[PDB]
Amino acid sequence: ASLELYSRDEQRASNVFDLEGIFREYNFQAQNIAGLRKDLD
Amino acid sequence: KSLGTLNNPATVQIQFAYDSLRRQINRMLGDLARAWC
Amino acid sequence: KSLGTLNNPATVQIQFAYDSLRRQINRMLGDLARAWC
């Protein structure tokens, strides 16, 4: 039989710092700010 | 969709060790049985 | 405190292969010894 202790997802989820969450939200906020600062029609 | 590969490159080699040792022992038993006959 | 698990899922399966092959060979030796007796 085929067995494994820690799967790929388990090792990926064992990180406190979520890079995807940090950068996606930061870029979203800056893009929204650049709209009001400029002509938002 | 995709097939769920597991990062265990040792299972295939363990199977070969058991399979290889099984083939030779069974051949020795057949040779011994003929002599006893 | 915690127990120090090692990421080696192959040690348990190697032990089974040795243990399984040991059990059958020892049974064959016992059967052969009875016939020789």
Chain B residues within an 8 Å CB radius of C36: none
Apex CA B30: angle with CA B29 and CA B36, to 5°? 85
Experimental method: cryo-EM
* B10: CB partners within 8 A, 6+ apart: C10, C13
Q: What is the resolution of this structure in A?
A: 3.4
In the 3-class helix/strand/coil scheme, how is C1-37 assigned residue by residue?
CCCCCCCCCCHHHHHHHHHHHHHHHHHHHHHHHHHHC
Place of tokens 């990062």: B7
Write a three-state SS string for chain A: CCCCCCCHHHHHCCCCCCHHHHHHHHHHHHHHHHHHHCCCC
DSSP assignment letter at B9: T
- Write out the two tokens for C7: 């990421």
Question: Chain A window 2-41: which residues touch C at a Cβ cutoff of 8 Å?
Answer: 3-6
The CA distance from A7 to B7, in Å, is 8
Residue C26: both structure tokens together:
């020892």
Residue C19, CA distances (Å) to A12, A40, C26 in order: 35, 74, 11
